[PDB]
Amino acid sequence: NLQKAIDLASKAAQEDKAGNYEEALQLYQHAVQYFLHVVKYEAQGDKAKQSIRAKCTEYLDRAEKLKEYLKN
């Protein structure tokens, strides 16, 4: 589940930066879904969880704004 979060997160960050926002948006949410799934179920460690928390918020903030205008 962790590898899926990073894999999708990398493609999402590249999609938005490249030009694709629609595909990147759906990818951003996916990365956060898998990331939180691990932290909630069984993360790697204390410091590890803190790393995902900052990342989960980073992508969420980007995707949040993206969908904002996309939906408007």
Side-chain angles (χ1 to χ4, degrees), residues 16-70:
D16 199 45
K17 215 151 214 262
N20 305 3
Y21 279 44
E22 272 207 47
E23 208 99 76
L25 179 55
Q26 275 288 13
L27 292 157
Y28 286 135
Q29 291 157 34
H30 269 192
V32 186
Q33 271 195 94
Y34 299 113
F35 273 134
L36 297 175
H37 184 95
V38 188
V39 188
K40 201 213 89 150
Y41 280 56
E42 45 191 50
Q44 311 272 322
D46 200 48
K47 182 264 291 308
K49 298 154 167 217
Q50 271 260 106
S51 217
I52 310 179
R53 271 178 263 177
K55 295 145 83 85
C56 270
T57 183
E58 182 101 300
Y59 304 124
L60 273 172
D61 201 65
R62 206 170 172 163
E64 272 257 51
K65 271 211 70 211
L66 246 88
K67 63 187 197 206
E68 208 179 304
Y69 82 78
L70 278 165

